[model samples]
Target: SMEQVAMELRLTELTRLLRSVLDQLQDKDPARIFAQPVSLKEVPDYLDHIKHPMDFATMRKRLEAQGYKNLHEFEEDFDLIIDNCMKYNARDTVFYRAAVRLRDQGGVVLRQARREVDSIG
Candidate 1:
C-alpha cells in the first residue's frame, strides 16, 4: 500500500541518521573510553558503580541488529553512554572531561541530523 511505502521511507531515513550520528561519535572519541566495554581487568570495580554500562561498540552492534525502535531509542543510548562515563569517572579526571566533550560534540552532530531529516516530509 502507499501508506506502507511511507513507513519504510521513514525507517530508512531514521536508520541512516542514526548511523550517521554514531559514525561521527566514533570518530570523535579517540580516547577509546566509550569505544568498547569497560575492561573488568582495568577497572575491576566498574560494575560496582555502573549497573547499566553501555558503549559505542555495543551501540554499533545494536544498530546493525535493528535494535533501535526509533531515533528516540538511539538518543537514549547516546546520552547514557556519556552519562555512564561522567558517573564512573570523577569530574576532575581526564575520562570525565573527555565524556563532557563527547557529549557536547555529539549534540552538535545530532542537531545537524535534525536539519537533514527535517525535509522530505
Candidate 2:
C-alpha cells in the first residue's frame, strides 16, 4: 500500500519533529512536574478530579510506539496535559499558572511544527 508506505516514509521525520516539540513543551513547564506522570503517592486523590491525566512521559512513550498517527493526535495529548492541570488546580496554584504559560509558549512551537509537517510533502 502506497499510503502505508507514505506513512512509514514520513514517520521518521514526524517522530523527530514531535520529539522536538515535546522538548520545547517540557522546558517551558515552570513547575517541572509535567515531564513525568503525576505521582499518586504525592496526591493519591489526583485522579478523583482528573479522569484522564496526560503528561510528557506518557506522550513520549506513545510517540516511540508510533501511536500518534497524525499531527492532531500528538497535539491533543499536548493540549490535554495543559488543560488537565488548569482544570484540576485553582487559578492561583502553580500548576494552573504553569499550564497557562505553556499554552502560549508551547502552543507557538506546536504551530511551527505543523507548518514543518506540511512542508514535508
Give the per-residue lDDT of model 2 (tens digit) for 1-121.
9898877978877887888888888889756768888889998999888888889999999999878878999989988898888888899987788888989888788888888888875
Clashing pairs in 1: none
Deviation in Å, model 1, residue 94 alpha carbon: 1.1
Against the true structure, candidate 2 has what lDDT? 0.86
- C-alpha positional error of residue 106 in candidate 1 after TM-score superposition, expressed in Å: 1.3
Task: Please report how far candidate 2 places residue 70 from its true position, in Å.
Answer: 0.8
Per-residue lDDT of 8-121 in model 1, one digit per residue for the tens?
A: 777777777789788998888887878888889998998889888899988989987777867778888988888988988899999999999998888888877767766643
